[PDB]
Amino acid sequence: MELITILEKTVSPDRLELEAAQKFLERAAVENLPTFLVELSRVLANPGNSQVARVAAGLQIKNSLTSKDPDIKAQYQQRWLAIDANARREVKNYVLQTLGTETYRPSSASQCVAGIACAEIPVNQWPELIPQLVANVTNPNSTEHMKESTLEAIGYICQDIDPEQLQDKSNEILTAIIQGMRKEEPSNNVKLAATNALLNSLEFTKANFDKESERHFIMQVVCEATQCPDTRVRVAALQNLVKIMSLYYQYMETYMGPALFAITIEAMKSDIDEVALQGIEFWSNVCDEEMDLAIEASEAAEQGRPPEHTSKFYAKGALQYLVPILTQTLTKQDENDDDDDWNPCKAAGVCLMLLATCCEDDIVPHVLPFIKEHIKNPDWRYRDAAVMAFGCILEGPEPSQLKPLVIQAMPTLIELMKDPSVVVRDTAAWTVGRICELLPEAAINDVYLAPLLQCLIEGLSAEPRVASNVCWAFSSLAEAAYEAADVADDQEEPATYCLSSSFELIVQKLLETTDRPDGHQNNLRSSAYESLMEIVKNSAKDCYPAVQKTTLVIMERLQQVLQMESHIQSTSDRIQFNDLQSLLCATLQNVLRKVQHQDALQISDVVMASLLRMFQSTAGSGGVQEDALMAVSTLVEVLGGEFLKYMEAFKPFLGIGLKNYAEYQVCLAAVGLVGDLCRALQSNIIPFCDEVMQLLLENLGNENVHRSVKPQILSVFGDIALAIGGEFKKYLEVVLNTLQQASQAQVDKSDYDMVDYLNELRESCLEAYTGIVQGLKGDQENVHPDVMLVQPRVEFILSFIDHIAGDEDHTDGVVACAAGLIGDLCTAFGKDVLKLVEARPMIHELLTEGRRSKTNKAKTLATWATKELRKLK
Amino acid sequence: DHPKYSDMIVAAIQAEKNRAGSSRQSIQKYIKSHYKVGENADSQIKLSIKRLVTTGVLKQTKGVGASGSFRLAK
Amino acid sequence: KEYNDFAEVFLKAFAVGVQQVLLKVLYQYKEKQYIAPRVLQQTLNYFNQGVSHAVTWKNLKPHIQGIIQDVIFPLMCYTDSDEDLWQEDVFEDFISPTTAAQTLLFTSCSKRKEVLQKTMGFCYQILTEPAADPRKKDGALHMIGSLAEILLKKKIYKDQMEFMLQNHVFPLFSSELGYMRARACWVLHYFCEVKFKVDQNLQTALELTRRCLIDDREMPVKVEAAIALQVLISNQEKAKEYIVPFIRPVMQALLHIIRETENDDLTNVIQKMICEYSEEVTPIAVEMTQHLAMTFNQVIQTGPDEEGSDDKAVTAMGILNTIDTLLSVVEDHKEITQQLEGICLQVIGTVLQQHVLEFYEEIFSLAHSLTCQQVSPQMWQLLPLVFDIFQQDGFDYFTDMMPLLHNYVTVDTDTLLSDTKYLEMIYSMCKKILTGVAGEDAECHAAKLLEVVILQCKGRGIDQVIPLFVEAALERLTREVKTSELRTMCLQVAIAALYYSPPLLFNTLENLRFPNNEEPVTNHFIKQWLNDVDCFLGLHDRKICVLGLCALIELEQRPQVLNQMSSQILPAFLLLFNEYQIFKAIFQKLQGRDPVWYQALTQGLNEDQGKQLQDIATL
């Protein structure tokens, strides 16, 4: 109202906030704009998200007395309507004037304009913005910044999900396309407007008029772009531009694509540059990204996957000339030592792969010989290079050519891995690993073994500093395991002692590996964990001595993880922590995968500490809903045992958790954990009622808000209610009352949805009555306390039962409880009237309907219940 | 109740009749305009993607990890 | 599940009633005669269903039902066995119900009913029946009931892991003196141990005992050991590490076996030996094959001896069969068999030299057995003599002739091109001599198809006689081999004949014609294309067109000559009736590319038909 008291006090949420506060936010905030254009505009900057008219209007409007009533539903638009500045149409047109003028470097208005889409979302449509924007776009003062500045509104407008058809705007856009392509721009930014403008207008489909002339312009764009480096990402705009061509090829004839082919040759011709020129060196990195485009350019013609448009494109026919180019492209040589990082280069490798697919005719004759040419004159870099290239060769079986070439490779390759440098062998090891999985015809099992034997023990020295490659060699050994599974017959009976001791060493190495000195490479902690899991899978009947220590190590890791977990560090950490935690879970299930009678008691024993720690920290930390929940699951998976002490420990935390307000919604998580511990012990039921009644009491208020957590709770409470056996009659009366109370409780609508599942809610009430029935005598004179309520219980049920009984959608459980209902209520009610006997057939048809089922079982008992149902006279 | 994270992702992938699936950005901004949202969408959602990968829902297509393009298995 | 009682849950009343009837029958025994149980089969058949009916009503939980059932078969059989047998011998009595239990079990597996414990109760009961007969039907019964009973108990209901048999035990003790052998034999006969991927140490001791069994003074003793040995080796095994060491004596015993002759199962074990032969550890295996080659020398020596007393066709077949087991594992090791094949050819030649067989059984066996043979020029040289006889043999009986004739053509494969060096020509003349209406015989449809097919195979690259062959054979064939019975064979034969070399027929046939071209056939073909839509060839109810037409439509050529008829033809079959990605992109381009001008004639109709055809084809 004044002094920010309403602006600040009003901010706190209150009942009917959109309706009353909305007058303040939408009308008052909106109200400020007519009096002062400046204050309202000033208003966007301090709290862009916090706009009473829009931000307040937007979420408070979505939930309302009427979920979807225009007169009743939106006050943000009405409130703003009073103030000219506040108006939704004023929002559009004024958003244009203010938003364009006040670019202010990064723009607050753009989000507001985007909200413009969101807030206007309640209204069917807004037509105010286009005429002025169109006029602005065609405005005489065509400033370079202004010409480029326009469309910020257009871009976000394109982004909005709602679809409307505008054509005059499309015509203006076409004019812009021709003029922009036509106009020369010396500043990267203006064309960036061209590119981003295009991609957003590209959308999924284009209503723009057809002509292939503009694309030719793209070809030209490369040449001048050759002269100036600009922005690596500006260049990205060029690469993206062609990529735009990649998405769509409307006319094959139109898309001659001669310029692209010509451009590739010139670029190919300008392979780097003589003497490594700098414009060219930057061009080489950008060229690498562009090269990613290059693979696409090669990919465009003769693609393997089904495509809308497929053609030689003048390249496959020219492949003969282009046959040489793949070998020629090799003009660029790199001596850099990196194993796990690709960046622009991966694109290089994939491009090589596409040529590999497209090799067609003459590839087979060339392949045996190509290796020989490299083999005849192989340099130290070349052999290592030969290995990387061979890795390119991996794709394509080349069966006639490959065996002789591969067979000599075993001999040739073997005199190579013993290179002295720690890094050179590692290079051999990774490429060798890919080959190893790749090749089964050649057999160096004996040849493979010395290195494996050597790798397991000898290659631990280089492990501490950047020893990931030694690990990579280990990964290769794991592949050796897979290859053994799929390479040649048998040979699975030897090397076990070697495996037992080496793996025995691996596991200890892992923890420090995870926190080991950085190589920042394609080495995965998660991947490492997966490798460990695979090794465990390869585990024998017993590896218990390792496992206890392993679990403790995990405990040490958990403590380290907890230290990382307790105080975060800017989120770079947040994620580096989180993924590694996911692997920690991998550890947890992996440790408990095996099960032995002797083993379980021992493992559970030491496990007790861990479980407890989880509870402590899990209850205490309050950081992740599923991580902690998952911890509950894994520790929870420890079925059986003396759970009286542990389970007893669980209830206060469970009761406390329900009481706890850390998470806005905790019902789904709460339901899952209980639905397991609840199952384990039923002999003593004393602990549950105290926390449960409150939780039960707490649930009714909670129930209105969520539909999903209703039937499950109704079913869950039924499960607690499920013991029956003529016990908890007092509780049973309350339980019976609760079902009535649940029916009595007011309906709740969430996300503009109310009672979506008629069956679960309606049936849920059916289940709930039955639950009281098991707890409470299906003969308790005062079955229903209330008179109004009583007619339905007393007389409504019999009439309703005939209709319901003849009714269908009989669930496997509602059907079974009902099966009990027929006999028990039936004997007492037997002889009430001819009508019960007479009205029986309607029930019979539904029972016949119930009969169709999958794997139905136990007719005897149901038959007995029905016998009681018909036990008449 | 609360919509399942997997559901959201399934709907987003399936809403685009496409082969290469989509850049997470598409699903994420889709979430931004189509659903209730919070500051931790990237961390909790991203981890959710990671977890739906762990459940084996999806097959990789382009990229590596939750930054890429991916397709359903059939 | 099983129908034992009326309505729902009736199954139960009948099974109780049967037990009650036994009790009523039990109080007074009027008959006091054997074979009383057999008369109860109608009742016995009724009883399993009734028991099933009680479980079916109750639908008792499988774990509880299984536990009850596990206690129950033994408890009721035992309670029933303890009372029924006294008031009804034991062994006979065990069998009908045992067989009946078998009947229940076969039905049970599909049903998934849970049972357990049939086997454990029996070992003790097994004690009850001696199962020893020196030379009476008694032995027969021992065979039938004991071995079968043990196998069933071990593998279906009892699911036992390990057992010690006292009856098995006496025989092990005190060597082979006296009875232990009589007892041991019964024991072994009645059981084979069943294990998965397990070495058995008792089996190792059994191998040493097998050596002692080899040292058996008498053949009958050797026989009782032999059945066990034959199955035992025939039985597949997880390890058999000491088996190779064990094998030489067995092989050495095999040697004595050739001299010893005697048992057919022992000779059959040789068959088992081949199976055992693929094994694991193939490279040494070759050296075993060479020793087996010396044993094969014995086999070659053996056949006449086998011929002299009791024929052992299997043994003759087995030498050939055994190589294949070696074929089973491939180490790429150089094969020394070539020379062996030469020996086989010499042996084969001796039978061939006589050129006759009174039985007309051994000759076919030699042929099919001998089908795998060297294709070397000498092997190549052998076929004309083999084929020359083949021409004589095929002609006398068409039915007898066809399987061999197909083989005779396969034999013709070595000759290959040039009609096997002009022999193909001899075969055609012989066929002409034996080709006619006489030829239609059960399977003639197939037979005539085969004959024509044979010709086509010879004519891999025999374009010149081909116009005459299709045309000449057909004119003669329609009158001579045309039959109402063979129309189904004929349509496919006609379609296939028409289907084969259509272009060669279309252009080369059109270009050069002897006695012109088959205008009637061409007229018939034109009518036939329309006719196919109207009438189903071979009375297949349209099965053939859809199946081949799938892959076939893109590849096959019918579009240019008579597209309107073909266009009219395709839908009717479909109405009556009811790899790809690379091919689909490639096919439109490929078909269009080789003759762009040619498609043009059927360009609109072809394209319209194609779009519809593609949808029908891929729909």
Please tell me if residue A105 touches chain C, with a CB cutoff of 8 Å: no
- Other C-beta atoms lying within 10 Å of the C-beta of residue C404: 20
- Contact status, residue C394 vs residue C434, Cβ threshold 8 Å: yes
In total, how many domains does chain C have? Answer: 1
Min distance C6 CA to chain A CA atoms (Å)? 14
If you ran DSSP here, which 8-state letter would residue A747 be given? P
What does residue C485 show for φ and ψ, rounded to 5 degrees?
Answer: -65, -40
Q: What share of chain B is helix, strand, coil (3-state, %, to 5)?
A: 50, 20, 35
Euclidean distance between CA atoms A449 and A430, whole angstroms: 16
Query: Å from A709 to nearest chain B CA?
Result: 6
Q: ∠ CA(C472), CA(C478), CA(C483), 5° rounding?
A: 150
**With an 8 Å Cβ cutoff, are A863 and C58 in contact?**
no
Contact assessment for residue A55 and residue A117, using Cβ atoms and an 8 Å cutoff: no
Q: Which helix (H) or strand (E) holds B69?
A: strand B67-72
* Paired tokens of C426: 């001899």
Could you tell me how far CA A364 lies from the centroid of its own chain?
43
Return the biggest CA–CA distance within chain A: 110
Q: Is B4 on the interface with A (CB under 8 A)?
A: no
| Amino acid identity for residue B19 in this structure | R
Quick check: A160 and B33 CB within 8 A?
yes
Cβ–Cβ under 8 Å, residues C91 and C140: no
Number of separate domains in chain B: 1
Mutate to test the interface with B, among A205, A340, A626 (most CBs of B within 10 A): A626
Of A666, A763, A676, whose CA–CA distance to A714 is shortest? Answer: A763
A570 touches chain C (CB under 8 A): no
Q: Is C619 helix (H, G, I), strand (E, B) or coil?
A: coil
Question: Is the dihedral angle over the CA atoms A356, A360, A362, A365 positive or is it negative?
Answer: positive
Q: Does A308 touch chain C (CB under 8 A)?
A: no
| Contact between C421 and C415 (Cβ < 8 Å) | yes
3-state SS assignment for residue B59: strand
Greatest pairwise CA separation for chain B in angstroms: 34
- Find which of A243, A568, A589, A751 to mutate to test the B interface (most B CBs within 10 Å of its CB): A751
**Which of A685, A598, A597 lies closest to A647 in space, CA to CA?**
A685
Determination technique used: cryo-EM
Paired residues of B62 in beta bridges: B69
Beta carbons of C585 and A306 less than 8 Å apart: yes
- The single residue listed with the structure tokens 């309706």 is A19
Q: Is residue C172 part of a domain?
A: no
Cα separations in angstroms, A375 against A382, A424, B14, C40: 9, 18, 50, 85
Pairwise CA distance, residues C349 & C373, whole Å? 13
How many H-runs (helices) and E-runs (strands) does chain A carry? 45, 0
Would residue A1 count as lying in a domain?
Answer: no
b/e C230-239 (16+ beta carbons within 10 angstroms → b): bebbbbebee
**Identity (one letter) of the amino acid at A769?**
Y
Mutation target among B2, B35, B52 for the A interface, most CBs of A within 10 A: B2
Cβ contact A161–B33 (<8 Å): yes
Name, in order, each residue with C-beta under 8 angstroms of A164's C-beta and a sequence gap of 6 or more.
A125
SS3 A776: coil
User: Could you tell me the two tokens for A484?
Assistant: 């053994």
Q: How far is B18 from chain A (nearest CA, A)?
A: 10
d(CA C324, CA C332): 14
Q: Name beta bridge partners: B71.
A: B59
Residue C161 amino acid letter:
M
CB proximity list for C192: less than 8 A, separation 6 or greater: C151, C154, C231, C232, C235
Q: Which residues contact C120 (CB under 8 A, 6 or more apart)?
A: C74, C158, C160
Q: Which residue has the tokens 């098995």?
A: C168
d(CA C144, CA A128): 98
CA dihedral for C435, C437, C442, C444, sign (positive or negative): positive
- Angle at CA of residue C532, ends C526 and C537, nearest 5°: 125
Residues of A with CB under 8 A from a CB of B: 117-118, 159-161, 204, 305, 571, 574-575, 578-579, 582, 626, 665, 668, 706-709, 750-751
What letters, b where the CB count within 10 A reaches 16 and e where it falls short, cover A1-15? eeeeeebeebbeeee
CATH number at A861 reads 1.25.10.10
List the structure tokens of B48.
Answer: 């959710």
> Looking at chain A, which subunits does it touch, using at least 3 CB pairs closer than 8 Å as the criterion?
B, C
Check if B55 contacts A (Cβ < 8 Å).
no
| Count of A-C CB contacts under 8 Å | 21
Q: What are phi and psi of B61, to 5 degrees?
A: -125, -70
Q: Which helix (H) or strand (E) holds C122?
A: helix C118-128
Joined together, the tokens standing for residue C475 give 């004119």
Q: What is the 3-state secondary structure (H, E, C) of A376-415?
A: HCCCHHHHHHHHHHHHHHCCCCCHHHHHHHHHHHHHHHHC
The span from the first CA to the last CA of chain A, in angstroms, equals 80
Which token pair is A861?
Answer: 């008992």
| Those residues with Cβ within 8 angstroms of residue B61's Cβ, 6 or more apart along the chain or in another chain | B20, B21, B68, B69, B70, B71
Full residue range of the structural domain in which residue C564 is found: 558-619
DSSP for A843-856 reads HHHHHHHHH--SS-
* Residue position matching structure tokens 């053994």: A484
Q: Do A582 and B54 touch (CB under 8 A)?
A: yes
Number of domains in chain A: 1
CA distance A17 to A12: 9
DSSP annotation of C40 reads G
Contacts of A857 in chain C (CB under 8 A): 59
Residue A481 CA to residue A630 CA, distance in Å, equals: 31
Nearest CA among C296, C216, C281 for reference residue C245: C281
Query: A578 vs B1: CB contact, 8 Å cut-off?
Result: no
Query: How many H-runs (helices) and E-runs (strands) does chain C carry?
Result: 31, 0
Output the CA torsion A292→A293→A298→A300 (10° steps): 130
Reduce the DSSP state of residue A142 to 3 states and report it: coil
- Whether residue A571 and residue B43 make contact (CB cut-off 8 A), yes or no, is yes
Contacts of A860 in chain C (CB under 8 A): 9, 57-60
> Is the CB of A310 less than 8 angstroms away from the CB of C585?
yes
Q: Which residue type, as a one-letter code, is found at position C59?
A: N
Q: For A118, which of B33, B36, B54 is closest by C-beta distance?
A: B33
Annotate C170-214 with DSSP letters as a single string: HHHTTTTSTTHHHHHHHHHHH-----SS---HHHHHHHHHHHHHH
Tell me, yes or no, whether chains B and C touch by having 3 or more C-beta pairs under 8 A.
no
Residue type, A599: D
Q: Does B32 touch chain A (CB under 8 A)?
A: no
The contacts of residue A387 (CB under 8 Å, 6+ apart) are: A416, A427, A428, A431, A432
Question: Are the Cβ atoms of A857 and C581 closer than 8 angstroms?
Answer: no
Phi-psi region of C189 (alpha: psi -120 to 50; beta: other; left: phi over 0): alpha
**Which chains lie within 8 Å of chain B at 3 or more CB pairs, if any?**
A
Closest approach of B20 to chain A, Cα-based (Å):
11
Distance between CA atoms of residues A825 and A847, nearest Å: 17
CA separation for the pair C328, A831 (Å, rounded): 79
C-alpha angle A81/A86/A91, rounded to 5°? 105
Secondary structure (DSSP) of C412-462: HHHH-TTTTTTHHHHHHHHHHHH-SGGG--TTHHHHHHHHHHHHHHHGGG-
Contact at 8 Å (CB) between C74 and C121? Answer: yes
The CA-based dihedral angle spanning residues A675, A681, A685, A689, taken in that order and rounded to the nearest 10 degrees: -30
- Residue A2 falls in which region: left (phi positive, over 0), alpha (psi -120 to 50) or beta: beta
Tokens 């254009």 found at: A37
Mutate to test the interface with B, among A55, A708, A761 (most CBs of B within 10 A): A708
> Resolution reached, in Å?
6.2
Supply the DSSP string of C308-371, one letter for each residue: HSS--HHHHHHHHHHHHHHHHS---PPP-HHHHHHHHHHHHHHHHHH---SSSSHHHHHHHHTT
Cα separation, B8 vs C150, whole angstroms? 60
Beta bridge partners of B69: B62
State phi, psi for C202 to the nearest 5 degrees.
-65, -35
Q: What is the DSSP letter of A52?
A: I
Contact B2 A668 (CB under 8 A): yes
Strand boundaries in A483-524, DSSP class E = none
Taking only Cα atoms into account, the Rg of chain C, rounded to an integer number of angstroms, comes to: 34
Asked if residue A197 lies in contact with residue A151, where contact means CB atoms within 8 angstroms, the answer is yes
Kindly state whether residue A867 falls inside one of the protein's structural domains: yes
The alpha-carbon radius of gyration of chain A (Å, integer) is 37
Record: contact B2-A579, CB cut-off 8 A: no
Residue of chain A whose Cα is closest to the Cα of B46: A575
Phi then psi for A640, rounded to 5 degrees? 70, -155
Q: Does B47 touch chain A (CB under 8 A)?
A: yes
- Residues in C touching A863 (Cβ below 8 Å): 8-9, 57
Quote the CA–CA distance of A823 and A816 in Å, as a whole number: 12
Put simply, whether B1 touches A (Cβ < 8 Å) is yes
DSSP letter, residue A789: H
Distance CA A845, CA A798 (A): 17
Of C59, C280, C329, the CB nearest to A860: C59
Residue A103 is which amino acid? T
Chain B residues touching residue A159 (CB < 8 angstroms): 29
Residue A10 lies in a domain: no
Query: Touching check for B62 and chain A: CB below 8 Å?
Result: no
List chains adjacent to chain C, taking adjacency as at least 3 C-beta pairs closer than 8 Å: A
Query: What tokens appear for A478 in the block?
Result: 């794991």
On whether the CB atoms of residues A329 and A343 are closer than 8 A, the answer is no
Q: How many CB atoms lie within 10 A of CB A566?
A: 11
- Residue to mutate among C11, C58, C581, C589, with most A CBs inside 10 A, is C58
* Closest to A333 measured CA to CA, from A385, A378, A384, A286: A385
**Subunit contact A863:C9, Cβ cutoff 8 A:** yes
Q: In sequence order, what are the beta bridge partners of A587?
A: none
User: Cα-atom radius of gyration of chain B, to the nearest Å?
Assistant: 12
**Residue C446 corresponds to which tokens in the numbers above?**
């197939």
H runs (alpha helix) in C459-595: 465-481, 487-499, 502-503, 510-511, 519-534, 543-555, 563-577, 580-593
Q: How far is A708 from chain B (nearest CA, A)?
A: 4
Q: Which chain A residues are closer than 8 Å to B2 by Cβ?
A: 665, 668, 706, 708
Residue span of the structural domain in which B8 resides: 1-74
Burial class, A178, CB count within 10 angstroms (exposed 0-12 / middle 13-18 / buried 19+): middle
CB-count exposure of residue A414 (10 Å: 0-12, 13-18, 19+): middle
Q: Chains A, B: CB contacts under 8 A, how many? A: 32
